[PDB]
Amino acid sequence: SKPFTLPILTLGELTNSRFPLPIDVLYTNPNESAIVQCQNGRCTLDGELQGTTQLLPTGICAFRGKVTQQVQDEHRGTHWNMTVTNLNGTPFDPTEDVPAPLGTPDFSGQIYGVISQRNTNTVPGEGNLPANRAHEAVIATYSPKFTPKLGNIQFSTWETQDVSSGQPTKFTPVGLASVDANSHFDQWTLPSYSGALTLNMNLAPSVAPVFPGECLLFFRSFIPLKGGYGNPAIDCLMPQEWVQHLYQESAPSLSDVALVRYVNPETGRTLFEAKLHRNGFLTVARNSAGPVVAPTNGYFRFDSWVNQFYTLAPM
Amino acid sequence: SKPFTLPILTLGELTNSRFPLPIDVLYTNPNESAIVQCQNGRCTLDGELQGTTQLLPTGICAFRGKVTQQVQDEGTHWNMTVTNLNGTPFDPTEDVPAPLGTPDFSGQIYGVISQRNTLPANRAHEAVIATYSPKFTPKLGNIQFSTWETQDVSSGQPTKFTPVGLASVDANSHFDQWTLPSYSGALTLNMNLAPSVAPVFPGECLLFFRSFIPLKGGYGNPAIDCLMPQEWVQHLYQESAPSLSDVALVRYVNPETGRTLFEAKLHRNGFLTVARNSAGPVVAPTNGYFRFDSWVNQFYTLAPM
């Protein structure tokens, strides 16, 4: 049995699996009322990707496809429909057992980024090179027009005309447009991947602590804003590098729970211990919300396989 | 002796180490006249990061700092002090060419500047950093970016540059992926550089991992070629396997058929050569990936492609 391992990476060497951001802090929120069921950054300890999770850091909250036409929408701005493919350019097959194309955003909000286009057709007078354009854009994932499982989404621009129909189009995510009440940011609310009033399918399962006194432990990143007030964050269950490592190793899981220790390598001391669950998430024994204030040189080390009955030393 | 290994990843599972892009194709260009001495995506086979290379995919061509002054070019420019990406002050006496993650090529890099004030107020705008400009002096702790926005950028507030593509590849935009910026300005020599790379055996050429980079406007199909993908940098850093010679033999394999499509030399300093006498993409099945075979030497003759 190939021994289970985690990469050796400090917080300052990790990135978020739910948005292209560095990990800023470890975080807990025990009184969270929402069901935690994110779809990016989902991977079992034996290397099975789940939900909409894919391996590329460039693929998280990205889209690839083609603009069809400008469309009318009651909301502010200029709106555009785009078909979407798989990130690798192949047609998205809705019959595959996934919730949406891999990399699709997994939360409600106004995602801000850049739409760019490189034309298929080239100009002989320009050395047989294609024309290009890029503009800021917003994708409202709670919109009834957000239907990535059906191979179509909509985005809005401040630019009023310089977006071309029928041309290859890329969305590069950057942050959120707003976190005002009217922008419906909720990191634990899933989009409706096939539109208003349909049930999502093929989801990665919800995660929760089951042992009294335990809460989920998250890898938290602060996400940029185009405007307005706020300090919004995106919390992932495991960083993207862990997804990548587990996928590579695919080590057999010898129980449902791996005991891990958060260590300071200089001192050699254990700062705290955590349970790393088979389905790919952490719990700790902690009774407060907020950041974990820990030495910058810290990282998780696999200790041993334990079981559900194991009692964690309080943080 | 910890055995050397490469990750098991198809091209479709790899990202560029010189710009935040997926790898699109493997690529050669034997008649390249420029010295190849990129500074991102540089790592020895035994796990030593070099140049401006760091581990985060989000750190490649990124900056962090604070804006200090608005200056109208006659679009709007903004002077920016830069720190290390982790927020600590950049120490110019450290043995690096510039803050880790600093872009390693000449051009107009297009992206988004965002700010969160010290609930806080926020703003973000499209921005361009001309890395060939006299004002591009990251080794001295300062750079300049330009915006189409004329006023709504704040001074003395935390600022992030998220790279997206290039502004232009027109003649006057000075895009050249193999020309290094002058990290301290035009009259000063760059220092602490990762070494240049080249084939040393007749009939060999460099093999690159190529990504196409977006453009804000204009005509073009620009690309950025890296020596190894970011995942290889990350893997080598993790493993730190001792290098048993100066050259590793690797094979590009189709795992379904088990057949080797071609072989390449993976050199100690962290780059590939192949025996190919043509320029352009390598046409290979999407399931293919490189596997370590054995340690060889400079005199080893690669099977021609």
Side-chain angles (χ1 to χ4, degrees), chain A residues 8-9 13-14 20-21 56 58 112 114 116 118 126 130 132-136 170 223-232 248, chain B residues 8-9 13-14 20-21 56 58 110 112 114 116 119-120 122-126 160 213-222 238:
Chain A
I8 301 177
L9 292 164
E13 298 167 333
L14 295 168
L21 301 169
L56 306 177
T58 57
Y112 164 69
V114 171
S116 60
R118 178 151 307 155
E126 295 289 345
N132 296 266
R133 64 218 57 79
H135 296 288
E136 296 168 288
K170 176 185 187 184
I223 184 163
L225 272 168
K226 169 63 180 177
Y229 294 101
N231 183 30
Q248 282 301 308
Chain B
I8 304 171
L9 294 165
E13 299 168 334
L14 292 170
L21 304 168
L56 304 176
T58 56
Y110 164 70
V112 171
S114 63
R116 177 153 305 158
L119 299 171
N122 295 268
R123 62 215 62 78
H125 297 287
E126 298 173 285
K160 177 187 187 184
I213 187 164
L215 268 168
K216 170 65 183 175
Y219 293 91
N221 183 28
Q238 284 302 306

Short mmCIF file of all heavy atoms in Angstrom, two decimals, chain A residues 8-9 13-14 20-21 56 58 112 114 116 118 126 130 132-136 170 223-232 248, chain B residues 8-9 13-14 20-21 56 58 110 112 114 116 119-120 122-126 160 213-222 238:
data_model
loop_
_atom_site.label_atom_id
_atom_site.label_comp_id
_atom_site.label_asym_id
_atom_site.label_seq_id
_atom_site.Cartn_x
_atom_site.Cartn_y
_atom_site.Cartn_z
N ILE A 8 4.75 19.29 1.09
CA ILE A 8 5.32 20.13 2.13
C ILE A 8 5.29 21.58 1.68
O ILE A 8 6.19 22.05 0.97
CB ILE A 8 6.76 19.71 2.46
CG1 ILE A 8 6.79 18.25 2.92
CG2 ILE A 8 7.36 20.63 3.52
CD1 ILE A 8 8.19 17.74 3.20
N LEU A 9 4.24 22.29 2.08
CA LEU A 9 3.99 23.65 1.61
C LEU A 9 3.43 24.49 2.74
O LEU A 9 2.47 24.09 3.40
CB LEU A 9 3.02 23.66 0.42
CG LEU A 9 3.51 23.06 -0.91
CD1 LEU A 9 2.34 22.77 -1.87
CD2 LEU A 9 4.56 23.94 -1.58
N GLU A 13 2.76 29.23 0.32
CA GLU A 13 3.09 28.49 -0.91
C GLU A 13 1.88 27.74 -1.46
O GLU A 13 2.03 26.87 -2.32
CB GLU A 13 4.25 27.51 -0.64
CG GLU A 13 5.54 28.21 -0.20
CD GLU A 13 6.59 27.26 0.36
OE1 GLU A 13 6.23 26.19 0.89
OE2 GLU A 13 7.79 27.58 0.26
N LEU A 14 0.69 28.08 -0.96
CA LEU A 14 -0.56 27.42 -1.37
C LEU A 14 -1.51 28.38 -2.09
O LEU A 14 -1.49 29.59 -1.86
CB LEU A 14 -1.29 26.83 -0.16
CG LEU A 14 -0.55 25.71 0.56
CD1 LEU A 14 -1.23 25.40 1.91
CD2 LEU A 14 -0.48 24.49 -0.33
N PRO A 20 -8.79 31.81 -8.26
CA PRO A 20 -7.32 31.94 -8.43
C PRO A 20 -6.70 32.99 -7.51
O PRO A 20 -6.46 34.13 -7.92
CB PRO A 20 -7.16 32.32 -9.92
CG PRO A 20 -8.47 32.96 -10.29
CD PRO A 20 -9.52 32.18 -9.49
N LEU A 21 -6.43 32.58 -6.28
CA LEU A 21 -5.94 33.47 -5.23
C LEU A 21 -4.98 32.70 -4.36
O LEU A 21 -5.13 31.48 -4.21
CB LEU A 21 -7.10 33.91 -4.33
CG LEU A 21 -8.27 34.65 -4.99
CD1 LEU A 21 -9.46 34.78 -4.01
CD2 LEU A 21 -7.84 36.01 -5.53
N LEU A 56 -6.11 22.41 -13.36
CA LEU A 56 -5.40 23.64 -13.71
C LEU A 56 -5.74 24.81 -12.80
O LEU A 56 -6.92 25.15 -12.64
CB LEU A 56 -5.72 24.06 -15.15
CG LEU A 56 -5.51 23.05 -16.27
CD1 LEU A 56 -5.97 23.66 -17.58
CD2 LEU A 56 -4.04 22.64 -16.36
N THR A 58 -5.36 27.73 -13.71
CA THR A 58 -5.92 28.67 -14.69
C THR A 58 -7.37 28.34 -15.07
O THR A 58 -8.05 29.14 -15.71
CB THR A 58 -5.06 28.68 -15.98
OG1 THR A 58 -4.98 27.35 -16.52
CG2 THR A 58 -3.66 29.18 -15.67
N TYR A 112 -16.25 39.08 -11.46
CA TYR A 112 -15.62 40.10 -12.30
C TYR A 112 -14.36 39.55 -12.92
O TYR A 112 -13.58 38.85 -12.26
CB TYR A 112 -15.28 41.30 -11.41
CG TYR A 112 -14.31 42.32 -11.97
CD1 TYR A 112 -14.65 43.15 -13.02
CD2 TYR A 112 -13.05 42.47 -11.41
CE1 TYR A 112 -13.76 44.09 -13.52
CE2 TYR A 112 -12.15 43.41 -11.89
CZ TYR A 112 -12.51 44.21 -12.94
OH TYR A 112 -11.61 45.14 -13.43
N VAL A 114 -12.07 39.40 -17.09
CA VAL A 114 -11.85 39.95 -18.43
C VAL A 114 -12.28 38.93 -19.47
O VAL A 114 -11.90 37.76 -19.40
CB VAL A 114 -10.37 40.34 -18.65
CG1 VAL A 114 -10.11 40.71 -20.12
CG2 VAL A 114 -9.99 41.51 -17.72
N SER A 116 -11.73 38.01 -23.31
CA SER A 116 -10.83 38.28 -24.42
C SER A 116 -11.19 37.40 -25.61
O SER A 116 -11.75 36.31 -25.43
CB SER A 116 -9.35 38.10 -24.02
OG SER A 116 -9.08 36.78 -23.59
N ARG A 118 -9.76 36.12 -29.64
CA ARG A 118 -8.83 36.04 -30.76
C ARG A 118 -9.60 35.45 -31.93
O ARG A 118 -10.07 34.30 -31.86
CB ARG A 118 -7.61 35.17 -30.44
CG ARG A 118 -6.62 35.04 -31.61
CD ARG A 118 -5.17 34.83 -31.15
NE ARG A 118 -4.83 35.89 -30.21
CZ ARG A 118 -3.91 35.84 -29.26
NH1 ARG A 118 -3.09 34.80 -29.12
NH2 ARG A 118 -3.78 36.87 -28.44
N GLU A 126 -2.31 41.63 -42.71
CA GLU A 126 -1.74 41.71 -41.37
C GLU A 126 -0.83 40.51 -41.08
O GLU A 126 -0.69 40.10 -39.93
CB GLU A 126 -2.85 41.80 -40.32
CG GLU A 126 -3.68 43.07 -40.41
CD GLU A 126 -2.90 44.30 -39.98
OE1 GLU A 126 -1.84 44.14 -39.35
OE2 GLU A 126 -3.35 45.43 -40.28
N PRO A 130 -4.74 37.23 -36.75
CA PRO A 130 -6.12 37.56 -36.39
C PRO A 130 -6.25 38.81 -35.53
O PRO A 130 -5.32 39.19 -34.83
CB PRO A 130 -6.54 36.35 -35.57
CG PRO A 130 -5.27 35.97 -34.84
CD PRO A 130 -4.16 36.21 -35.86
N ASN A 132 -7.98 40.99 -32.37
CA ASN A 132 -8.20 40.70 -30.96
C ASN A 132 -8.92 41.83 -30.26
O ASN A 132 -8.82 42.99 -30.67
CB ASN A 132 -6.86 40.51 -30.24
CG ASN A 132 -6.07 39.32 -30.74
OD1 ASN A 132 -6.16 38.23 -30.19
ND2 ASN A 132 -5.28 39.53 -31.78
N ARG A 133 -9.61 41.50 -29.16
CA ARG A 133 -10.12 42.50 -28.25
C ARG A 133 -10.33 41.90 -26.87
O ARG A 133 -10.56 40.70 -26.74
CB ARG A 133 -11.43 43.11 -28.77
CG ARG A 133 -12.61 42.13 -28.86
CD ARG A 133 -13.46 42.41 -30.10
NE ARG A 133 -12.66 42.35 -31.33
CZ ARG A 133 -12.31 41.21 -31.94
NH1 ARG A 133 -12.71 40.04 -31.45
NH2 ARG A 133 -11.56 41.25 -33.03
N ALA A 134 -10.24 42.73 -25.84
CA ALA A 134 -10.56 42.28 -24.49
C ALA A 134 -11.24 43.41 -23.74
O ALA A 134 -10.93 44.57 -23.98
CB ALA A 134 -9.29 41.83 -23.75
N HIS A 135 -12.18 43.06 -22.85
CA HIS A 135 -12.87 44.05 -22.01
C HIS A 135 -13.23 43.47 -20.66
O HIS A 135 -13.40 42.25 -20.52
CB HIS A 135 -14.15 44.53 -22.70
CG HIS A 135 -13.86 45.26 -23.97
ND1 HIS A 135 -13.32 46.53 -23.98
CD2 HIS A 135 -13.96 44.88 -25.27
CE1 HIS A 135 -13.13 46.91 -25.23
NE2 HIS A 135 -13.50 45.93 -26.03
N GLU A 136 -13.36 44.33 -19.65
CA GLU A 136 -13.87 43.87 -18.37
C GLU A 136 -15.28 43.33 -18.53
O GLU A 136 -16.08 43.81 -19.35
CB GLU A 136 -13.92 45.02 -17.37
CG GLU A 136 -12.57 45.62 -17.00
CD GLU A 136 -12.76 46.91 -16.24
OE1 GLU A 136 -13.16 47.91 -16.87
OE2 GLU A 136 -12.56 46.91 -15.01
N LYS A 170 -12.51 33.84 -24.21
CA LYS A 170 -11.97 33.36 -22.95
C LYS A 170 -12.42 34.28 -21.82
O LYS A 170 -12.37 35.51 -21.96
CB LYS A 170 -10.44 33.41 -23.03
CG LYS A 170 -9.73 33.02 -21.75
CD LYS A 170 -8.22 33.21 -21.87
CE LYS A 170 -7.53 32.66 -20.64
NZ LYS A 170 -6.06 32.90 -20.64
N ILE A 223 -10.79 38.02 -1.70
CA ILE A 223 -11.02 38.13 -3.14
C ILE A 223 -11.19 39.60 -3.52
O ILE A 223 -11.89 40.32 -2.83
CB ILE A 223 -12.27 37.29 -3.55
CG1 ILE A 223 -12.50 37.32 -5.07
CG2 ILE A 223 -13.51 37.72 -2.76
CD1 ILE A 223 -13.45 36.18 -5.58
N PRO A 224 -10.53 40.05 -4.61
CA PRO A 224 -10.62 41.47 -5.00
C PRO A 224 -12.03 41.92 -5.38
O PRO A 224 -12.88 41.10 -5.77
CB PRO A 224 -9.70 41.57 -6.22
CG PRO A 224 -8.73 40.43 -6.06
CD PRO A 224 -9.55 39.33 -5.44
N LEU A 225 -12.27 43.23 -5.26
CA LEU A 225 -13.54 43.85 -5.66
C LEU A 225 -13.34 44.95 -6.69
O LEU A 225 -12.44 45.78 -6.57
CB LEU A 225 -14.22 44.46 -4.43
CG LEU A 225 -15.13 43.54 -3.63
CD1 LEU A 225 -15.48 44.20 -2.30
CD2 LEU A 225 -16.41 43.25 -4.41
N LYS A 226 -14.22 44.97 -7.68
CA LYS A 226 -14.23 46.03 -8.70
C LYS A 226 -14.63 47.37 -8.08
O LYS A 226 -14.16 48.43 -8.51
CB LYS A 226 -15.20 45.64 -9.83
CG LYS A 226 -15.52 46.74 -10.85
CD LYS A 226 -14.31 47.22 -11.65
CE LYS A 226 -14.74 48.31 -12.62
NZ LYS A 226 -13.55 48.85 -13.36
N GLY A 227 -15.50 47.32 -7.07
CA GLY A 227 -15.94 48.54 -6.41
C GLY A 227 -16.76 48.23 -5.18
O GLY A 227 -17.07 47.07 -4.90
N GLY A 228 -17.09 49.28 -4.44
CA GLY A 228 -17.95 49.17 -3.28
C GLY A 228 -17.17 48.81 -2.02
O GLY A 228 -15.95 48.68 -2.04
N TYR A 229 -17.90 48.66 -0.92
CA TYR A 229 -17.31 48.33 0.36
C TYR A 229 -17.33 46.84 0.59
O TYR A 229 -18.21 46.13 0.09
CB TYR A 229 -18.09 49.02 1.49
CG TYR A 229 -18.00 50.53 1.46
CD1 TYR A 229 -19.04 51.29 0.96
CD2 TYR A 229 -16.88 51.18 1.95
CE1 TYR A 229 -18.96 52.67 0.93
CE2 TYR A 229 -16.79 52.55 1.93
CZ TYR A 229 -17.84 53.29 1.42
OH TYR A 229 -17.75 54.66 1.41
N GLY A 230 -16.32 46.36 1.32
CA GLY A 230 -16.30 44.96 1.69
C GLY A 230 -14.91 44.39 1.79
O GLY A 230 -13.96 44.96 1.26
N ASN A 231 -14.80 43.27 2.49
CA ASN A 231 -13.57 42.47 2.51
C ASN A 231 -13.94 41.01 2.29
O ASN A 231 -13.71 40.17 3.16
CB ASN A 231 -12.83 42.64 3.84
CG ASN A 231 -11.50 41.89 3.87
OD1 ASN A 231 -10.84 41.71 2.85
ND2 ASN A 231 -11.10 41.45 5.07
N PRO A 232 -14.53 40.71 1.13
CA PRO A 232 -15.02 39.34 0.91
C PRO A 232 -13.91 38.29 0.83
O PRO A 232 -12.77 38.56 0.43
CB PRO A 232 -15.74 39.44 -0.44
CG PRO A 232 -15.11 40.62 -1.12
CD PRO A 232 -14.82 41.59 -0.01
N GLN A 248 -2.09 12.93 -8.12
CA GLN A 248 -0.84 12.30 -8.56
C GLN A 248 -0.61 10.99 -7.82
O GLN A 248 -0.32 9.95 -8.43
CB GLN A 248 0.35 13.24 -8.29
CG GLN A 248 0.52 14.36 -9.30
CD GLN A 248 0.71 13.82 -10.69
OE1 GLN A 248 1.57 12.98 -10.93
NE2 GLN A 248 -0.12 14.28 -11.62
N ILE B 8 2.95 12.92 -13.42
CA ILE B 8 2.18 12.34 -14.52
C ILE B 8 1.04 13.27 -14.94
O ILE B 8 -0.05 13.26 -14.35
CB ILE B 8 1.64 10.95 -14.15
CG1 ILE B 8 2.80 10.04 -13.73
CG2 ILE B 8 0.87 10.34 -15.32
CD1 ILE B 8 2.36 8.71 -13.14
N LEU B 9 1.31 14.09 -15.96
CA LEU B 9 0.40 15.14 -16.39
C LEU B 9 0.46 15.33 -17.90
O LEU B 9 1.53 15.54 -18.47
CB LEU B 9 0.73 16.47 -15.70
CG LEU B 9 0.54 16.58 -14.19
CD1 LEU B 9 1.26 17.82 -13.67
CD2 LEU B 9 -0.94 16.61 -13.81
N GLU B 13 -3.10 19.16 -18.71
CA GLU B 13 -3.10 19.27 -17.24
C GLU B 13 -1.92 20.10 -16.72
O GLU B 13 -1.60 20.05 -15.53
CB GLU B 13 -3.07 17.86 -16.62
CG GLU B 13 -4.29 17.01 -16.99
CD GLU B 13 -4.16 15.55 -16.64
OE1 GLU B 13 -3.03 15.03 -16.56
OE2 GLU B 13 -5.21 14.90 -16.46
N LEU B 14 -1.28 20.86 -17.61
CA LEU B 14 -0.10 21.65 -17.26
C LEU B 14 -0.35 23.13 -17.48
O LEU B 14 -1.15 23.51 -18.34
CB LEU B 14 1.08 21.22 -18.12
CG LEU B 14 1.65 19.82 -17.88
CD1 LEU B 14 2.65 19.45 -18.97
CD2 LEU B 14 2.27 19.75 -16.50
N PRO B 20 0.27 33.19 -16.46
CA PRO B 20 -0.82 32.30 -16.00
C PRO B 20 -1.73 31.84 -17.13
O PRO B 20 -2.82 32.39 -17.36
CB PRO B 20 -1.58 33.18 -15.00
CG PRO B 20 -1.30 34.61 -15.46
CD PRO B 20 0.16 34.55 -15.89
N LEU B 21 -1.26 30.82 -17.83
CA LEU B 21 -1.92 30.27 -19.02
C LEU B 21 -1.80 28.76 -19.00
O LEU B 21 -0.79 28.23 -18.52
CB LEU B 21 -1.25 30.78 -20.30
CG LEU B 21 -1.15 32.29 -20.47
CD1 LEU B 21 -0.21 32.67 -21.60
CD2 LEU B 21 -2.54 32.90 -20.67
N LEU B 56 3.89 29.89 -6.53
CA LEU B 56 2.46 30.12 -6.73
C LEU B 56 2.11 30.42 -8.18
O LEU B 56 2.67 31.33 -8.78
CB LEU B 56 2.02 31.32 -5.89
CG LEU B 56 2.28 31.32 -4.39
CD1 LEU B 56 1.83 32.66 -3.81
CD2 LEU B 56 1.57 30.17 -3.71
N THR B 58 -0.45 31.93 -8.96
CA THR B 58 -1.02 33.27 -8.85
C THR B 58 0.05 34.35 -8.74
O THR B 58 -0.27 35.54 -8.83
CB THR B 58 -1.94 33.39 -7.62
OG1 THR B 58 -1.21 33.02 -6.45
CG2 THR B 58 -3.15 32.45 -7.76
N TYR B 110 -0.81 43.44 -19.88
CA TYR B 110 -2.16 43.91 -19.62
C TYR B 110 -2.76 43.11 -18.49
O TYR B 110 -2.58 41.89 -18.42
CB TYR B 110 -2.99 43.74 -20.90
CG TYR B 110 -4.49 43.81 -20.74
CD1 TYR B 110 -5.13 45.00 -20.44
CD2 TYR B 110 -5.27 42.67 -20.93
CE1 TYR B 110 -6.52 45.06 -20.32
CE2 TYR B 110 -6.65 42.72 -20.81
CZ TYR B 110 -7.27 43.90 -20.50
OH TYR B 110 -8.64 43.93 -20.39
N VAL B 112 -5.27 43.72 -14.46
CA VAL B 112 -6.16 44.52 -13.62
C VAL B 112 -5.43 44.90 -12.34
O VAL B 112 -4.84 44.05 -11.66
CB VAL B 112 -7.46 43.73 -13.28
CG1 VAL B 112 -8.28 44.47 -12.23
CG2 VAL B 112 -8.27 43.50 -14.56
N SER B 114 -6.14 46.18 -8.66
CA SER B 114 -7.23 46.27 -7.68
C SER B 114 -6.69 46.76 -6.35
O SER B 114 -5.52 46.57 -6.04
CB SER B 114 -7.95 44.92 -7.53
OG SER B 114 -7.08 43.92 -7.03
N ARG B 116 -7.79 47.41 -2.04
CA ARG B 116 -8.67 47.32 -0.87
C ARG B 116 -8.05 48.21 0.19
O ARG B 116 -6.92 47.98 0.63
CB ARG B 116 -8.77 45.88 -0.37
CG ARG B 116 -9.62 45.73 0.92
CD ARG B 116 -10.26 44.34 1.04
NE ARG B 116 -11.02 44.10 -0.17
CZ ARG B 116 -11.38 42.91 -0.65
NH1 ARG B 116 -11.14 41.79 0.02
NH2 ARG B 116 -12.00 42.88 -1.82
N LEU B 119 -16.40 48.50 6.83
CA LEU B 119 -15.84 47.75 5.71
C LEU B 119 -15.01 48.67 4.82
O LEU B 119 -15.37 49.83 4.61
CB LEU B 119 -16.96 47.12 4.89
CG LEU B 119 -17.86 46.11 5.60
CD1 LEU B 119 -19.04 45.76 4.71
CD2 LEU B 119 -17.08 44.87 5.98
N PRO B 120 -13.89 48.16 4.29
CA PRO B 120 -13.03 49.03 3.46
C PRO B 120 -13.59 49.30 2.06
O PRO B 120 -14.31 48.47 1.49
CB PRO B 120 -11.73 48.23 3.37
CG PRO B 120 -12.18 46.79 3.44
CD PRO B 120 -13.33 46.81 4.44
N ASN B 122 -13.12 49.79 -2.05
CA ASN B 122 -12.40 49.04 -3.08
C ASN B 122 -12.52 49.69 -4.45
O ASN B 122 -13.50 50.38 -4.74
CB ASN B 122 -12.99 47.63 -3.22
CG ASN B 122 -12.81 46.80 -2.00
OD1 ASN B 122 -11.83 46.06 -1.89
ND2 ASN B 122 -13.75 46.89 -1.05
N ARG B 123 -11.55 49.42 -5.32
CA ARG B 123 -11.68 49.75 -6.74
C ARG B 123 -10.77 48.86 -7.55
O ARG B 123 -9.75 48.40 -7.06
CB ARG B 123 -11.36 51.23 -7.01
CG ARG B 123 -9.92 51.62 -6.66
CD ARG B 123 -9.86 53.05 -6.12
NE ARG B 123 -10.63 53.15 -4.88
CZ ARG B 123 -10.19 52.72 -3.70
NH1 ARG B 123 -8.98 52.22 -3.56
NH2 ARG B 123 -10.98 52.81 -2.64
N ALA B 124 -11.14 48.63 -8.81
CA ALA B 124 -10.26 47.94 -9.74
C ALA B 124 -10.41 48.53 -11.12
O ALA B 124 -11.50 48.98 -11.48
CB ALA B 124 -10.56 46.44 -9.77
N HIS B 125 -9.32 48.53 -11.89
CA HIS B 125 -9.33 49.02 -13.26
C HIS B 125 -8.33 48.26 -14.12
O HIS B 125 -7.33 47.76 -13.61
CB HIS B 125 -8.96 50.51 -13.29
CG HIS B 125 -9.95 51.37 -12.58
ND1 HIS B 125 -11.19 51.64 -13.10
CD2 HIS B 125 -9.89 52.00 -11.38
CE1 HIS B 125 -11.87 52.40 -12.25
NE2 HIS B 125 -11.10 52.63 -11.20
N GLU B 126 -8.61 48.17 -15.42
CA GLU B 126 -7.62 47.67 -16.37
C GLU B 126 -6.36 48.51 -16.31
O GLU B 126 -6.40 49.74 -16.17
CB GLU B 126 -8.15 47.73 -17.79
CG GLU B 126 -9.37 46.89 -18.04
CD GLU B 126 -9.92 47.13 -19.43
OE1 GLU B 126 -10.54 48.19 -19.65
OE2 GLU B 126 -9.71 46.28 -20.31
N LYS B 160 -2.92 45.41 -5.89
CA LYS B 160 -2.59 44.12 -6.49
C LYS B 160 -2.67 44.24 -8.01
O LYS B 160 -3.63 44.81 -8.54
CB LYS B 160 -3.63 43.09 -6.02
CG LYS B 160 -3.46 41.70 -6.63
CD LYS B 160 -4.61 40.78 -6.26
CE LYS B 160 -4.33 39.36 -6.73
NZ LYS B 160 -5.48 38.45 -6.47
N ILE B 213 -1.11 33.80 -25.56
CA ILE B 213 -1.42 34.82 -24.56
C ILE B 213 -2.47 35.79 -25.12
O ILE B 213 -2.36 36.21 -26.26
CB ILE B 213 -0.11 35.56 -24.13
CG1 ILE B 213 -0.37 36.52 -22.96
CG2 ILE B 213 0.60 36.24 -25.31
CD1 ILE B 213 0.92 36.97 -22.25
N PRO B 214 -3.49 36.15 -24.32
CA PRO B 214 -4.51 37.07 -24.81
C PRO B 214 -3.98 38.46 -25.13
O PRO B 214 -2.95 38.89 -24.59
CB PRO B 214 -5.49 37.17 -23.63
CG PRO B 214 -5.30 35.90 -22.88
CD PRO B 214 -3.82 35.63 -22.98
N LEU B 215 -4.71 39.14 -26.01
CA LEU B 215 -4.43 40.52 -26.39
C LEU B 215 -5.61 41.45 -26.11
O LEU B 215 -6.77 41.12 -26.41
CB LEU B 215 -4.13 40.60 -27.88
CG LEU B 215 -2.66 40.49 -28.29
CD1 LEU B 215 -2.56 40.28 -29.79
CD2 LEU B 215 -1.90 41.73 -27.86
N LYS B 216 -5.31 42.64 -25.59
CA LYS B 216 -6.33 43.67 -25.36
C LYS B 216 -6.87 44.23 -26.68
O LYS B 216 -8.04 44.60 -26.78
CB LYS B 216 -5.71 44.78 -24.49
CG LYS B 216 -6.55 46.06 -24.35
CD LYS B 216 -7.86 45.83 -23.61
CE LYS B 216 -8.66 47.13 -23.56
NZ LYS B 216 -10.01 46.94 -22.95
N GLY B 217 -5.99 44.29 -27.68
CA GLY B 217 -6.37 44.81 -28.98
C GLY B 217 -5.31 44.54 -30.03
O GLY B 217 -4.21 44.07 -29.72
N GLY B 218 -5.65 44.84 -31.28
CA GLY B 218 -4.71 44.74 -32.37
C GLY B 218 -4.65 43.36 -33.00
O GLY B 218 -5.35 42.43 -32.60
N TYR B 219 -3.80 43.24 -34.01
CA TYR B 219 -3.62 41.96 -34.67
C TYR B 219 -2.48 41.20 -34.01
O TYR B 219 -1.54 41.80 -33.47
CB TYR B 219 -3.33 42.18 -36.16
CG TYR B 219 -4.52 42.76 -36.88
CD1 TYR B 219 -4.69 44.13 -37.00
CD2 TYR B 219 -5.50 41.93 -37.41
CE1 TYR B 219 -5.78 44.66 -37.65
CE2 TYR B 219 -6.60 42.45 -38.06
CZ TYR B 219 -6.74 43.81 -38.17
OH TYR B 219 -7.84 44.34 -38.82
N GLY B 220 -2.57 39.87 -34.04
CA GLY B 220 -1.52 39.04 -33.52
C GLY B 220 -1.99 37.72 -32.96
O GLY B 220 -3.16 37.54 -32.63
N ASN B 221 -1.05 36.79 -32.85
CA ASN B 221 -1.30 35.54 -32.14
C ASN B 221 -0.11 35.22 -31.25
O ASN B 221 0.55 34.19 -31.41
CB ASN B 221 -1.57 34.41 -33.13
CG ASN B 221 -1.92 33.10 -32.45
OD1 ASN B 221 -2.44 33.09 -31.33
ND2 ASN B 221 -1.62 31.99 -33.12
N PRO B 222 0.17 36.11 -30.29
CA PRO B 222 1.38 35.95 -29.49
C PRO B 222 1.39 34.74 -28.58
O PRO B 222 0.34 34.28 -28.10
CB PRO B 222 1.42 37.23 -28.65
CG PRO B 222 0.00 37.68 -28.58
CD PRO B 222 -0.56 37.35 -29.94
N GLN B 238 9.45 20.01 -4.47
CA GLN B 238 8.99 19.04 -3.47
C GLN B 238 9.99 17.89 -3.30
O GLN B 238 10.39 17.56 -2.18
CB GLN B 238 7.63 18.45 -3.86
CG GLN B 238 6.43 19.38 -3.62
CD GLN B 238 6.32 19.81 -2.18
OE1 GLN B 238 6.28 18.97 -1.27
NE2 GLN B 238 6.30 21.12 -1.95
#
